[PDB]
Structures are given as structure tokens and as C-alpha cells.
Amino acid sequence: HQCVKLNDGHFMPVLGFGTYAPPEVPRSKALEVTKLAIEAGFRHIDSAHLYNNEEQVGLAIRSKIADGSVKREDIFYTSKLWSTFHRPELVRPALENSLKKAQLDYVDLYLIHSPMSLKPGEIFDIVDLCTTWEAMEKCKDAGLAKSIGVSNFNRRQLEMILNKPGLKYKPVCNQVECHPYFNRSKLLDFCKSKDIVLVAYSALGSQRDKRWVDPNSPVLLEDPVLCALAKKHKRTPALIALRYQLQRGVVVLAKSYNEQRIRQNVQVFEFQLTAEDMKAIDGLDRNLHYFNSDSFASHPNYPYSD
Ligand SMILES: NC(=O)c1ccc[n+]([C@@H]2O[C@H](COP(=O)([O-])OP(=O)(O)OC[C@H]3O[C@@H](n4cnc5c(N)ncnc54)[C@H](OP(=O)(O)O)[C@@H]3O)[C@@H](O)[C@H]2O)c1
Ligand SMILES: C[C@@H]1CCCCN1S(=O)(=O)c1ccc(N2C=CCC2=O)cc1
């Protein structure tokens, strides 16, 4: 295992467990798989208000602390502020609600989930995200979140926060879709220049949910270059996709609700890719965001406009 030092001095483990499962998966499965993830060695656990699982994920964490397997300070838990709660007066209550659902005193990381503000209390809203970010800074000062960051921001959106007059805490990270078909090189370079960690979701090619993903889109884990690399290293396409991210300096999430795959994914630390391997993977980039829906693409702050 290892950690990256965030720009506020806290540490984030480089491999994260993805906890989202679509609604057909019974809620209690999150409890079970989160416990297995922790048994396999995951210490970074990624959730959100949106994922409707914070109560099960928090209960997994508390159970593994309660039985001596881990201490609270060995777990890095992320939640996220949903886009109906961008108005500043809504931010701390949203974080408090997440904390109550998970039964934790603090989150290691709290993210603005998306720049795409939605109308509260119920379609887009226009919110000054610099005001949302001030509200986020307040949550760090209160000890509700050790660190704060963003998700789904593009470069212009991130700059807007970084250039805020009176900025107190830079975002520690930008959690974004990132994988060999959509590798975000230029955004990564920008993030690296500002000491903001890029965190990759859908690093294994997404769950291909029919609500948002084109089933015609290429299946990342069937890619022939990943398959060739998997054979060369005697690993699996998933492990090649994860290892790629680690060697680019990207913190990588990995969702699995399968016991065997959960245990396999921690092997990312057991091997290395060469410069030539990495070049071959870099050759797959093709501007493919799996999340590609009419329900998002017209939003005035849709990030894939730039
Ligand atoms: N910030 C945001 O807007 C945002 C958006 C999307 C996701 N996320 C976060 O990112 C996490 C991960 O992304 P994601 O949900 O798109 O899924 P992902 O990590 O890309 O995984 C996709 C599929 O890979 C399969 N898989 C996992 N390990 C494998 C292995 N070793 N070999 C073969 N298949 C494997 C899993 O199926 P099985 O369960 O059957 O193993 C999984 O459904 C989410 O759970 C959530 O925590 C955040
Ligand atoms: C998918 C859209 C368009 C691309 C940027 C991000 N978003 S979003 O912020 O509207 C968003 C983020 C996450 C989700 N989501 C829904 C269930 C799992 C999941 O991550 C849905 C929409």
C-alpha cells in the first residue's frame, strides 16, 4: 500500500474502494462488500449522498473498528455534496446529514460532487460555486471534513476556485472520470502544477449503467492492448488499468461487489509497467466519457463542453 500527501498536509491512500451499486443491488450488499474491501487491505473508501449507501458503508467501517481490524485514523472516508445543496447555507447541513447516516464524527474528505448545480428542495440552478467553496472551507475549519476538494470539474472551473479572492484552502483533489479511453492528460498536468491530486473514477471502464452509458461504447476491460499487457505480465486487464493510473501519479478508485475481484484489485501494488507499456496504454486515449447522456449534456456547467 501507499499514500499521497495532499496539499493541506493530510495523507490519502492511492487505491480507493468504489462503493456505488445501482438500485437493483440490495442496500445491505454495501455493508458486506465494504467489510471485505477492508479485509483485503483497502483503507480509502469512496461514497456520496447520491449513492444512497452511507448508512451501510459507515456501518462496515464501524464494525471493522469495533472488532479491532482497524482504527478510525487508518480509514480514509470520502463523501460528497450533492448538486441540489450548492447554496452555501445548505453545505454544512448536508455534511452533517452524511455524518449522521454513516455514524462518524468526521469525513476524511468532502467533495463538491459536480459543478452542475440543480434546483434545491424538489433542472439547473445558477450558484456561485465560490460561495459553495467558502462553505466547504468552513466545514474544514469546524473539523467536520479533514480535507475538502471537488469532483467533475474541468480546468476552467477549477481555476475559478483557485483564483477566488481571499481563498483559504485549495481543493486537495479533483475526482473525475479517467481511464485509458479518456485519460485526462492535460487536466492531470494542470492538477500536478497546482499540487491537486487527480482521482480517477470509472478507472475500470464504468458499470455501463443503461441510464447513462451507451452499450455500443467499447468495453475497456476487453481492450486488446490491455489484454496483451495482462498476458505479458500475467495479471488481468483490470490490474493493468489500475496500475497505469498509479504510475501517472493518479489516485485510483475501483468498485467491485465480488469477493474474488475485491482481493485481486489490491495486487496493483505487486507489479510494475515499463515506459513502453505506459506508452501503449497512452495510445488508447479517444475522448470517450462513458457518462454520455442528454440528461446532463445541456447543463450550463456541463464540464465536457471545454
Ligand atoms: N464523482 C463522481 O461523479 C463519480 C462517478 C462515478 C463513480 N464514482 C466513484 O468511483 C467508483 C468507481 O467507478 P465505477 O462505479 O464507474 O466502477 P469501476 O471502478 O470503473 O468498475 C467497473 C466494473 O469493474 C468491475 N471490476 C472491478 N474489479 C474488477 C476486476 N479485477 N476484474 C474484472 N472486473 C472488475 C466491477 O464489477 P463487479 O462489482 O462485478 O466486480 C465494476 O462494476 C464508484 O463506485 C464511486 O465510488 C464517482
Ligand atoms: C454524469 C454527469 C455528466 C458528466 C459530469 C458528471 N455528471 S453529474 O455530476 O451530473 C453525475 C455524477 C454522478 C452520477 N452518478 C449517478 C449514480 C452513480 C453516479 O456516480 C450521476 C451524475
Side-chain angles (χ1 to χ4, degrees), residues 3-28 30-70 72-99 102-121 123-155 157-185 187-209 211-230 232-259 261-306:
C3 289
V4 60
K5 196 195 197 192
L6 300 168
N7 63 34
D8 68 359
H10 295 291
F11 288 87
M12 174 188 279
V14 299
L15 174 69
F17 186 59
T19 64
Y20 181 83
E24 54 275 16
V25 172
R27 287 305 82 184
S28 66
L31 166 62
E32 177 187 342
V33 303
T34 303
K35 288 196 294 206
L36 289 170
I38 290 170
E39 291 163 22
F42 282 86
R43 297 289 175 271
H44 175 171
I45 296 167
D46 187 81
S47 185
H49 165 78
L50 193 57
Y51 306 164
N52 195 28
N53 69 11
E54 286 167 300
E55 46 287 77
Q56 309 283 349
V57 176
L59 181 28
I61 296 161
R62 290 177 296 108
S63 175
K64 291 312 275 199
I65 292 171
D67 71 23
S69 303
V70 291
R72 176 71 189 81
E73 60 264 30
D74 304 322
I75 296 297
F76 186 104
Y77 178 77
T78 301
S79 187
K80 323 189 185 74
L81 179 82
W82 189 240
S83 308
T84 55
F85 310 110
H86 287 175
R87 286 173 196 271
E89 62 279 15
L90 299 183
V91 173
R92 177 166 178 164
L95 180 43
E96 292 171 349
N97 185 246
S98 284
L99 287 169
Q103 296 287 102
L104 292 177
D105 302 315
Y106 66 91
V107 299
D108 296 272
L109 180 57
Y110 204 43
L111 307 181
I112 303 181
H113 205 147
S114 174
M116 295 153 63
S117 308
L118 306 173
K119 281 323 200 342
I123 122 101
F124 72 87
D125 196 14
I126 304 299
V127 180
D128 180 357
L129 293 181
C130 291
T131 69
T132 313
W133 187 254
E134 289 161 348
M136 295 289 284
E137 297 176 323
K138 285 176 194 54
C139 295
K140 186 178 166 62
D141 287 329
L144 298 173
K146 297 301 182 191
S147 305
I148 58 174
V150 297
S151 183
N152 295 297
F153 279 41
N154 63 31
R155 172 171 175 165
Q157 294 167 326
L158 236 196
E159 290 182 314
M160 281 178 225
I161 306 304
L162 300 171
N163 296 338
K164 198 185 84 78
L167 182 76
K168 200 171 180 190
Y169 302 117
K170 287 155 56 170
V172 299
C173 69
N174 185 14
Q175 182 186 126
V176 299
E177 180 177 342
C178 182
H179 47 76
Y181 295 158
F182 188 49
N183 77 30
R184 315 308 298 275
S185 291
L187 182 61
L188 177 56
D189 284 350
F190 175 82
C191 287
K192 287 180 177 174
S193 67
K194 304 298 179 184
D195 196 26
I196 299 178
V197 173
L198 194 168
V199 181
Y201 73 74
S202 299
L204 300 178
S206 91
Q207 309 187 42
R208 307 186 60 85
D209 196 300
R211 289 170 291 169
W212 318 292
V213 182
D214 185 9
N216 292 297
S217 63
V219 183
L220 181 70
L221 298 179
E222 297 173 359
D223 181 89
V225 169
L226 298 187
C227 284
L229 291 173
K232 163 174 173 171
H233 287 283
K234 295 166 150 52
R235 300 287 175 171
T236 63
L239 285 164
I240 298 305
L242 304 174
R243 184 74 197 180
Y244 171 63
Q245 299 297 1
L246 292 199
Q247 293 188 212
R248 304 168 88 214
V250 168
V251 167
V252 73
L253 305 177
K255 171 265 181 177
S256 184
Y257 273 40
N258 176 276
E259 180 166 358
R261 288 184 293 270
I262 295 172
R263 293 178 185 287
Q264 183 195 126
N265 288 341
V266 305
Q267 293 179 22
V268 69
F269 297 109
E270 296 172 3
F271 78 100
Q272 258 172 55
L273 292 177
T274 62
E276 303 80 1
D277 295 342
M278 292 290 287
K279 178 179 191 209
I281 301 163
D282 276 344
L284 303 177
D285 193 32
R286 65 192 63 183
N287 199 52
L288 187 89
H289 52 91
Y290 285 106
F291 289 82
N292 177 19
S293 176
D294 282 348
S295 77
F296 308 130
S298 289
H299 190 294
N301 262 90
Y302 185 55
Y304 302 142
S305 301
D306 289 0

